C-alpha cells in the first residue's frame with residue numbers, strides 16, 4: 685500500500701522552510717504492491 | 733464492527749478521511765455509517781448499581 689499524505693499551506697517566505705506546525709491529512713491509498721527503493725522528482729522546463 | 737449503544741446526532745467536525753472515533757479505552761465512540769456517509773455518535777446505554 686502506497687500511502688500519500690498531503691497538506692497545502694499559504695506561505696510568504698522567500699528562501700527556506702517556514703517555521704511552524706501543520707499536520708498532513710491523508711490524500712490517497714494506492715494498492716500498488718511493488719518494490720520501491722529509488723525515486724525521482726519531475727520538473728517542468730520553460731521554453732522561449 | 734459490533735457493539736451496543738444509543739446512536740444520536742453529533743457536532744464533532746470529522747475530517748473527510750475520518751470514519752470512526754475512539755476513546756481512551758479504545759472502544760468506539762462515534763462511527764460513520766456507510767451508504768449515507770453521515771456521522772453517528774455512539775453513547776453507551778445507561779447503567780448503574782442497584
Ligand SMILES: *[C@@H]1O[C@H](CO)[C@@H](O)[C@H](O)[C@H]1NC(C)=O
Nearest residue numbers: 751764765766767768769770
Ligand atoms: C452506496 O454507498 C456509496 C459509498 O460507497 C455511496 O456513495 C452511495 O451514495 C450509496 N448509495 C445508496 C443508494 O445508498
